[PDB]
Amino acid sequence: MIGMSEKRGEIMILIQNAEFELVHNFKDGFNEEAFKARYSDILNKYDYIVGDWGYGQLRLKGFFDDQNQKATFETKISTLDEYIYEYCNFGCAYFVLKRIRKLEHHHHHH
Secondary structure, three states, X not given: OOOOOOOOOOOEEEEOOEEEEEEEEEOOOOOHHHHHHHOOHHHHHOOEEEEEOOOOOOEEEEXXXXXXXXXXXXXXXXXXXXXXHHOOOOXXXXXXXXXXXXXXXXXXXX
């Protein structure tokens, strides 16, 4: 039941055995190598990795589950908007990856 009948995808980023999905991307700020180079194990804690190019230096800042289970916009972080505005304001680039409540990586074990 791993990979629960999933025929849904988009831009899923699997790193350090953690499954992520690119939910929001502006100005094509999503640079994969940059992300995975800026990534850190402690970030897996947050279940949400926000990457902004504010101040030039790419920041990966994690947030906690903002939406309630009854929210259809699972990927929306209401406190995020004000955060981005402080750093990556109009005339900038940023991206948001969401950490999935599972990990489907077919490791052919013996």
